[PDB]
Design a protein around this ligand. Structure first.
Ligand SMILES: CO[C@@H]1O[C@@H](C)[C@@H](O)[C@@H](O)[C@@H]1O
Ligand SMILES: [Ca+2]
Ligand SMILES: [Ca+2]
Length: 126
């Protein structure tokens, strides 16, 4: 049957890849699009735990697809899927820097809104 490309890891119907190179959020998204995917969306605790345990691993902070670029304080996934699940750090999102793109950081995989021009690794989903 159909499989992920080499170096993409399968999970619950989709393929996942850590992009190690540090880029801005938009640059990370463009790289995912070039590979036929998009930035990671996370729709369940089970998918979050796969991400932190197998994809992110020791990497401390990376971009995912959540963002409020279009409408402040209304976060959406760049890939167009529904926001059915969130895992924010306490008091995030806080739109501190005047922050419209979302990172995962820390061992529990909780999320933070960050300046989009920060260079960080990312995760694509396919
Ligand atoms: C006070 O705000 C928190 O700490 C800052 C260093 C930033 O990482 C910011 O995104 C985060 O929400
Ligand atoms: Ca914002
Ligand atoms: Ca923040």
């Amino acid at each position: 049957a159909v499989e992920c490309e080499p170096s993409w890891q399968p999970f619950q119907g989709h393929c996942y890849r850590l992009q190690a190179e540090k880029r801005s959020w938009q640059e990370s998204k463009k790289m995912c699009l070039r590979g036929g995917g998009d930035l990671l969306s996370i729709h369940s605790m089970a998918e979050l735990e796969f991400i932190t345990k197998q994809i992110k691993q020791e990497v401390e902070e990376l971009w995912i697809g959540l963002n409020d670029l279009k409408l402040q304080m209304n976060f959406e996934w760049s890939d167009g899927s529904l926001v059915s699940f969130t895992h924010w750090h306490p008091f995030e999102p806080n739109n501190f820097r005047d922050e419209d793109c979302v990172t995962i950081w820390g061992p529990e995989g909780r999320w933070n809104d960050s300046p989009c021009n920060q260079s960080l690794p990312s995760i694509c989903k396919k």
